[PDB]
């Protein structure tokens, strides 16, 4: 099927009509998404099948056809762009300055942007267009707004 | 059954809409991959 680098929608026909359950990144022949989007199930790209290669529920990540290829990291200072792919809507870039998730195991960048659940897996980019992480695993704060970690493979 | 459809190229776009704040939050990550506010 399609192996071209880029951002892709993850769809299902098991519910009413065609429903977008998430988003992913194709890079160097490997498809990258969040674990909660597919639960590690196989995917279809036209007539071709993508089998899971690596997954980790705690990181909430999964790769297909090969190992995780996204290695860029947020520099901790600069603004980044969420390349949001919302259900039924065109791919759209949103620029923001990340905040921080402070954990007992270190600090992680976080983006305070609110999108429908089916937007999970959208890539976060640096100024060179490199994917520094995936959007879609985070918390709801004291207001009701959503804050996502910048989740990158470790 | 799940399938994928191409949605675009991955590129930085000059003059994208600029929004969102930068909150510093103390968080915990459990064995199930869920974040929670401490
Ligand atoms: C022997 N390998 C095969 C599978 N594997 C990955 O796919 C991987 C590589 C880099 C990452 F950052 C990551 F999150 C995951 C790790 C172990």
PDB file of C-alpha atoms and ligand atoms in Angstrom:
ATOM      1  CA  UNK A   1       0.000   0.000   0.000  1.00  0.00           C
ATOM      2  CA  UNK A   2       1.056   3.605   0.673  1.00  0.00           C
ATOM      3  CA  UNK A   3       4.520   3.925   2.238  1.00  0.00           C
ATOM      4  CA  UNK A   4       5.156   7.618   1.469  1.00  0.00           C
ATOM      5  CA  UNK A   5       6.473   9.664   4.457  1.00  0.00           C
ATOM      6  CA  UNK A   6       3.801  11.841   6.058  1.00  0.00           C
ATOM      7  CA  UNK A   7       0.886  12.171   8.453  1.00  0.00           C
ATOM      8  CA  UNK A   8      -1.970   9.643   8.220  1.00  0.00           C
ATOM      9  CA  UNK A   9      -5.462   9.182   9.673  1.00  0.00           C
ATOM     10  CA  UNK A  10      -6.232   5.882  11.502  1.00  0.00           C
ATOM     11  CA  UNK A  11      -9.808   4.836  10.605  1.00  0.00           C
ATOM     12  CA  UNK A  12     -12.260   2.066  11.496  1.00  0.00           C
ATOM     13  CA  UNK A  13     -15.446   0.767   9.848  1.00  0.00           C
ATOM     14  CA  UNK A  14     -16.582  -1.245  12.974  1.00  0.00           C
ATOM     15  CA  UNK A  15     -18.792   1.610  14.286  1.00  0.00           C
ATOM     16  CA  UNK A  16     -21.391   3.798  12.403  1.00  0.00           C
ATOM     17  CA  UNK A  17     -19.925   4.942   9.042  1.00  0.00           C
ATOM     18  CA  UNK A  18     -16.141   5.476   8.828  1.00  0.00           C
ATOM     19  CA  UNK A  19     -14.789   6.744  12.174  1.00  0.00           C
ATOM     20  CA  UNK A  20     -11.386   8.354  12.809  1.00  0.00           C
ATOM     21  CA  UNK A  21      -9.857   6.768  15.956  1.00  0.00           C
ATOM     22  CA  UNK A  22      -6.453   8.501  15.682  1.00  0.00           C
ATOM     23  CA  UNK A  23      -3.442   9.756  13.678  1.00  0.00           C
ATOM     24  CA  UNK A  24       0.089   8.460  12.924  1.00  0.00           C
ATOM     25  CA  UNK A  25       3.465   9.220  11.273  1.00  0.00           C
ATOM     26  CA  UNK A  26       5.057   7.288   8.422  1.00  0.00           C
ATOM     27  CA  UNK A  27       8.838   7.796   8.313  1.00  0.00           C
ATOM     28  CA  UNK A  28      11.540   5.568   6.764  1.00  0.00           C
ATOM     29  CA  UNK A  29       8.917   2.854   5.986  1.00  0.00           C
ATOM     30  CA  UNK A  30       7.754   2.631   9.643  1.00  0.00           C
ATOM     31  CA  UNK A  31       4.305   3.752  10.889  1.00  0.00           C
ATOM     32  CA  UNK A  32       4.282   5.392  14.355  1.00  0.00           C
ATOM     33  CA  UNK A  33       1.195   5.974  16.546  1.00  0.00           C
ATOM     34  CA  UNK A  34      -0.021   5.952  20.157  1.00  0.00           C
ATOM     35  CA  UNK A  35      -0.812   2.550  21.701  1.00  0.00           C
ATOM     36  CA  UNK A  36      -4.319   3.602  22.848  1.00  0.00           C
ATOM     37  CA  UNK A  37      -5.249   4.404  19.185  1.00  0.00           C
ATOM     38  CA  UNK A  38      -4.786   0.824  17.850  1.00  0.00           C
ATOM     39  CA  UNK A  39      -4.360  -1.330  21.048  1.00  0.00           C
ATOM     40  CA  UNK A  40      -1.576  -3.052  19.037  1.00  0.00           C
ATOM     41  CA  UNK A  41      -3.912  -4.435  16.334  1.00  0.00           C
ATOM     42  CA  UNK A  42      -2.723  -4.893  12.679  1.00  0.00           C
ATOM     43  CA  UNK A  43      -3.510  -2.111  10.157  1.00  0.00           C
ATOM     44  CA  UNK A  44      -4.426  -2.008   6.477  1.00  0.00           C
ATOM     45  CA  UNK A  45      -2.986   0.403   3.850  1.00  0.00           C
ATOM     46  CA  UNK A  46      -5.001  -0.323   0.680  1.00  0.00           C
ATOM     47  CA  UNK A  47      -4.281  -3.979  -0.176  1.00  0.00           C
ATOM     48  CA  UNK A  48      -1.174  -4.158   2.115  1.00  0.00           C
ATOM     49  CA  UNK A  49      -0.983  -5.143   5.789  1.00  0.00           C
ATOM     50  CA  UNK A  50       1.066  -3.373   8.489  1.00  0.00           C
ATOM     51  CA  UNK A  51       1.999  -5.658  11.423  1.00  0.00           C
ATOM     52  CA  UNK A  52       3.074  -4.259  14.851  1.00  0.00           C
ATOM     53  CA  UNK A  53       6.872  -4.441  15.417  1.00  0.00           C
ATOM     54  CA  UNK A  54       7.273  -2.782  18.857  1.00  0.00           C
ATOM     55  CA  UNK A  55       4.874  -1.495  21.518  1.00  0.00           C
ATOM     56  CA  UNK A  56       4.849  -0.250  25.105  1.00  0.00           C
ATOM     57  CA  UNK A  57       1.612   0.520  27.032  1.00  0.00           C
ATOM     58  CA  UNK A  58       3.465   2.601  29.645  1.00  0.00           C
ATOM     59  CA  UNK A  59       5.062   4.942  27.041  1.00  0.00           C
ATOM     60  CA  UNK A  60       1.666   4.672  25.116  1.00  0.00           C
ATOM     61  CA  UNK A  61       3.532   4.092  21.821  1.00  0.00           C
ATOM     62  CA  UNK A  62       3.625   1.515  18.985  1.00  0.00           C
ATOM     63  CA  UNK A  63       5.569   1.139  15.688  1.00  0.00           C
ATOM     64  CA  UNK A  64       4.635  -0.928  12.558  1.00  0.00           C
ATOM     65  CA  UNK A  65       6.945  -2.615   9.927  1.00  0.00           C
ATOM     66  CA  UNK A  66      10.149  -1.681  11.796  1.00  0.00           C
ATOM     67  CA  UNK A  67      11.643  -0.076  14.917  1.00  0.00           C
ATOM     68  CA  UNK A  68      10.724   3.431  16.192  1.00  0.00           C
ATOM     69  CA  UNK A  69      12.557   5.991  13.927  1.00  0.00           C
ATOM     70  CA  UNK A  70      11.569   9.352  15.577  1.00  0.00           C
ATOM     71  CA  UNK A  71      14.547  10.578  17.641  1.00  0.00           C
ATOM     72  CA  UNK A  72      14.317  14.390  17.724  1.00  0.00           C
ATOM     73  CA  UNK A  73      13.735  16.061  21.112  1.00  0.00           C
ATOM     74  CA  UNK A  74      12.171  19.383  22.251  1.00  0.00           C
ATOM     75  CA  UNK A  75      15.057  21.828  23.045  1.00  0.00           C
ATOM     76  CA  UNK A  76      13.216  23.076  26.186  1.00  0.00           C
ATOM     77  CA  UNK A  77      13.173  26.709  24.968  1.00  0.00           C
ATOM     78  CA  UNK A  78      11.567  27.080  21.533  1.00  0.00           C
ATOM     79  CA  UNK A  79       7.998  27.129  20.249  1.00  0.00           C
ATOM     80  CA  UNK A  80       6.873  24.006  18.394  1.00  0.00           C
ATOM     81  CA  UNK A  81       4.022  23.131  16.024  1.00  0.00           C
ATOM     82  CA  UNK A  82       1.277  20.577  16.507  1.00  0.00           C
ATOM     83  CA  UNK A  83       0.379  19.225  13.068  1.00  0.00           C
ATOM     84  CA  UNK A  84      -3.206  18.497  14.065  1.00  0.00           C
ATOM     85  CA  UNK A  85      -5.268  16.116  11.920  1.00  0.00           C
ATOM     86  CA  UNK A  86      -8.819  16.410  13.367  1.00  0.00           C
ATOM     87  CA  UNK A  87     -11.591  13.988  12.275  1.00  0.00           C
ATOM     88  CA  UNK A  88     -13.300  15.092   8.999  1.00  0.00           C
ATOM     89  CA  UNK A  89     -11.020  18.168   8.826  1.00  0.00           C
ATOM     90  CA  UNK A  90      -7.872  19.147   6.914  1.00  0.00           C
ATOM     91  CA  UNK A  91      -4.357  18.819   8.453  1.00  0.00           C
ATOM     92  CA  UNK A  92      -3.641  22.158  10.279  1.00  0.00           C
ATOM     93  CA  UNK A  93      -0.434  23.519  11.965  1.00  0.00           C
ATOM     94  CA  UNK A  94      -0.749  25.189  15.405  1.00  0.00           C
ATOM     95  CA  UNK A  95       2.229  26.952  16.958  1.00  0.00           C
ATOM     96  CA  UNK A  96       2.655  26.973  20.760  1.00  0.00           C
ATOM     97  CA  UNK A  97       5.318  27.301  23.495  1.00  0.00           C
ATOM     98  CA  UNK A  98       5.270  24.050  25.496  1.00  0.00           C
ATOM     99  CA  UNK A  99       4.811  23.924  29.246  1.00  0.00           C
ATOM    100  CA  UNK A 100       6.311  21.146  31.455  1.00  0.00           C
ATOM    101  CA  UNK A 101       5.135  17.883  33.040  1.00  0.00           C
ATOM    102  CA  UNK A 102       7.377  17.494  36.114  1.00  0.00           C
ATOM    103  CA  UNK A 103       7.619  13.833  37.200  1.00  0.00           C
ATOM    104  CA  UNK A 104       9.638  11.841  39.782  1.00  0.00           C
ATOM    105  CA  UNK A 105      11.686  10.555  36.761  1.00  0.00           C
ATOM    106  CA  UNK A 106      12.378  13.911  35.064  1.00  0.00           C
ATOM    107  CA  UNK A 107      10.765  16.724  33.079  1.00  0.00           C
ATOM    108  CA  UNK A 108       8.776  16.306  29.830  1.00  0.00           C
ATOM    109  CA  UNK A 109       7.461  19.037  27.471  1.00  0.00           C
ATOM    110  CA  UNK A 110       3.671  19.437  27.344  1.00  0.00           C
ATOM    111  CA  UNK A 111       1.341  21.177  24.866  1.00  0.00           C
ATOM    112  CA  UNK A 112      -1.815  22.943  26.069  1.00  0.00           C
ATOM    113  CA  UNK A 113      -3.970  22.452  22.977  1.00  0.00           C
ATOM    114  CA  UNK A 114      -7.467  20.894  23.011  1.00  0.00           C
ATOM    115  CA  UNK A 115      -8.574  18.604  20.154  1.00  0.00           C
ATOM    116  CA  UNK A 116     -11.136  15.751  19.737  1.00  0.00           C
ATOM    117  CA  UNK A 117      -9.991  12.282  21.010  1.00  0.00           C
ATOM    118  CA  UNK A 118      -9.567  11.062  17.386  1.00  0.00           C
ATOM    119  CA  UNK A 119      -6.680  13.585  16.962  1.00  0.00           C
ATOM    120  CA  UNK A 120      -4.386  11.385  19.231  1.00  0.00           C
ATOM    121  CA  UNK A 121      -1.140  10.480  17.385  1.00  0.00           C
ATOM    122  CA  UNK A 122      -0.783  13.880  15.624  1.00  0.00           C
ATOM    123  CA  UNK A 123       2.938  14.847  15.444  1.00  0.00           C
ATOM    124  CA  UNK A 124       4.595  17.749  17.267  1.00  0.00           C
ATOM    125  CA  UNK A 125       7.411  19.361  15.179  1.00  0.00           C
ATOM    126  CA  UNK A 126      10.494  21.479  15.752  1.00  0.00           C
ATOM    127  CA  UNK A 127      11.500  24.377  13.389  1.00  0.00           C
ATOM    128  CA  UNK A 128      13.339  21.873  11.143  1.00  0.00           C
ATOM    129  CA  UNK A 129      10.143  19.861  10.550  1.00  0.00           C
ATOM    130  CA  UNK A 130      11.469  16.971  12.712  1.00  0.00           C
ATOM    131  CA  UNK A 131       8.968  15.015  14.788  1.00  0.00           C
ATOM    132  CA  UNK A 132       9.894  15.587  18.455  1.00  0.00           C
ATOM    133  CA  UNK A 133       6.901  13.562  19.786  1.00  0.00           C
ATOM    134  CA  UNK A 134       3.221  12.587  19.433  1.00  0.00           C
ATOM    135  CA  UNK A 135       0.187  14.427  20.831  1.00  0.00           C
ATOM    136  CA  UNK A 136      -2.618  12.647  22.683  1.00  0.00           C
ATOM    137  CA  UNK A 137      -1.612  11.307  26.120  1.00  0.00           C
ATOM    138  CA  UNK A 138      -2.017  13.722  29.021  1.00  0.00           C
ATOM    139  CA  UNK A 139      -4.245  15.300  31.705  1.00  0.00           C
ATOM    140  CA  UNK A 140      -7.317  17.560  32.217  1.00  0.00           C
ATOM    141  CA  UNK A 141      -6.415  20.507  34.488  1.00  0.00           C
ATOM    142  CA  UNK A 142      -8.357  22.563  37.184  1.00  0.00           C
ATOM    143  CA  UNK A 143     -10.219  24.446  34.381  1.00  0.00           C
ATOM    144  CA  UNK A 144     -11.367  21.536  32.168  1.00  0.00           C
ATOM    145  CA  UNK A 145      -8.828  22.213  29.354  1.00  0.00           C
ATOM    146  CA  UNK A 146      -6.520  19.433  28.044  1.00  0.00           C
ATOM    147  CA  UNK A 147      -2.693  19.325  28.394  1.00  0.00           C
ATOM    148  CA  UNK A 148      -0.861  16.610  26.375  1.00  0.00           C
ATOM    149  CA  UNK A 149       2.705  15.318  27.008  1.00  0.00           C
ATOM    150  CA  UNK A 150       5.126  15.613  24.067  1.00  0.00           C
ATOM    151  CA  UNK A 151       5.487  11.754  23.974  1.00  0.00           C
ATOM    152  CA  UNK A 152       8.710  10.603  22.232  1.00  0.00           C
ATOM    153  CA  UNK A 153      10.084   6.954  22.062  1.00  0.00           C
ATOM    154  CA  UNK A 154      12.700   6.194  24.840  1.00  0.00           C
TER     155      UNK A 154
ATOM    156  CA  UNK B   1     -10.699  -3.538  11.006  1.00  0.00           C
ATOM    157  CA  UNK B   2      -8.399  -0.497  11.007  1.00  0.00           C
ATOM    158  CA  UNK B   3      -6.981   1.290   7.974  1.00  0.00           C
ATOM    159  CA  UNK B   4      -4.766   4.321   7.247  1.00  0.00           C
ATOM    160  CA  UNK B   5      -5.235   7.258   4.782  1.00  0.00           C
ATOM    161  CA  UNK B   6      -2.597   9.870   3.930  1.00  0.00           C
ATOM    162  CA  UNK B   7      -3.496  13.353   5.300  1.00  0.00           C
ATOM    163  CA  UNK B   8      -0.415  15.447   4.391  1.00  0.00           C
ATOM    164  CA  UNK B   9       3.332  16.145   4.475  1.00  0.00           C
ATOM    165  CA  UNK B  10       5.088  16.793   7.791  1.00  0.00           C
ATOM    166  CA  UNK B  11       6.448  20.369   7.566  1.00  0.00           C
ATOM    167  CA  UNK B  12       6.815  23.514   9.701  1.00  0.00           C
ATOM    168  CA  UNK B  13       4.517  26.256   8.325  1.00  0.00           C
ATOM    169  CA  UNK B  14       5.488  29.948   8.520  1.00  0.00           C
ATOM    170  CA  UNK B  15       2.629  32.031   9.946  1.00  0.00           C
ATOM    171  CA  UNK B  16       0.608  29.189  11.469  1.00  0.00           C
ATOM    172  CA  UNK B  17      -2.067  30.157  14.093  1.00  0.00           C
ATOM    173  CA  UNK B  18      -0.215  30.792  17.413  1.00  0.00           C
ATOM    174  CA  UNK B  19      -2.151  29.737  20.583  1.00  0.00           C
ATOM    175  CA  UNK B  20      -2.037  27.782  23.892  1.00  0.00           C
ATOM    176  CA  UNK B  21      -0.377  28.605  27.202  1.00  0.00           C
ATOM    177  CA  UNK B  22       2.724  26.827  28.843  1.00  0.00           C
ATOM    178  CA  UNK B  23       1.624  25.318  32.219  1.00  0.00           C
ATOM    179  CA  UNK B  24       4.201  23.749  34.612  1.00  0.00           C
ATOM    180  CA  UNK B  25       2.424  20.799  36.282  1.00  0.00           C
ATOM    181  CA  UNK B  26       3.513  18.127  38.772  1.00  0.00           C
ATOM    182  CA  UNK B  27       2.335  14.827  37.300  1.00  0.00           C
ATOM    183  CA  UNK B  28       2.588  11.033  37.913  1.00  0.00           C
ATOM    184  CA  UNK B  29       2.622   8.258  35.240  1.00  0.00           C
ATOM    185  CA  UNK B  30       1.118   4.920  36.255  1.00  0.00           C
ATOM    186  CA  UNK B  31       1.892   1.374  34.983  1.00  0.00           C
ATOM    187  CA  UNK B  32      -1.155   1.661  32.614  1.00  0.00           C
ATOM    188  CA  UNK B  33       0.380   4.702  30.792  1.00  0.00           C
ATOM    189  CA  UNK B  34      -2.089   7.189  32.351  1.00  0.00           C
ATOM    190  CA  UNK B  35      -0.920  10.589  33.566  1.00  0.00           C
ATOM    191  CA  UNK B  36      -2.517  12.082  36.712  1.00  0.00           C
ATOM    192  CA  UNK B  37      -2.120  15.484  38.416  1.00  0.00           C
ATOM    193  CA  UNK B  38      -0.301  15.202  41.772  1.00  0.00           C
TER     194      UNK B  38
HETATM  195  C1  LIG C   1      15.726  -3.931  19.755  1.00  0.00           C
HETATM  196  N1  LIG C   1      14.774  -2.805  19.583  1.00  0.00           N
HETATM  197  C2  LIG C   1      13.658  -3.187  18.704  1.00  0.00           C
HETATM  198  C3  LIG C   1      12.367  -2.387  19.022  1.00  0.00           C
HETATM  199  N2  LIG C   1      12.672  -1.053  19.558  1.00  0.00           N
HETATM  200  C4  LIG C   1      12.112   0.070  19.054  1.00  0.00           C
HETATM  201  O1  LIG C   1      11.297   0.031  18.150  1.00  0.00           O
HETATM  202  C5  LIG C   1      12.462   1.387  19.678  1.00  0.00           C
HETATM  203  C6  LIG C   1      13.635   2.040  19.295  1.00  0.00           C
HETATM  204  C7  LIG C   1      13.908   3.327  19.737  1.00  0.00           C
HETATM  205  C8  LIG C   1      13.000   3.952  20.557  1.00  0.00           C
HETATM  206  F1  LIG C   1      13.213   5.231  20.960  1.00  0.00           F
HETATM  207  C9  LIG C   1      11.850   3.312  20.950  1.00  0.00           C
HETATM  208  F2  LIG C   1      10.920   4.016  21.650  1.00  0.00           F
HETATM  209  C10 LIG C   1      11.577   2.024  20.547  1.00  0.00           C
HETATM  210  C11 LIG C   1      13.547  -1.036  20.742  1.00  0.00           C
HETATM  211  C12 LIG C   1      14.286  -2.341  20.879  1.00  0.00           C
END
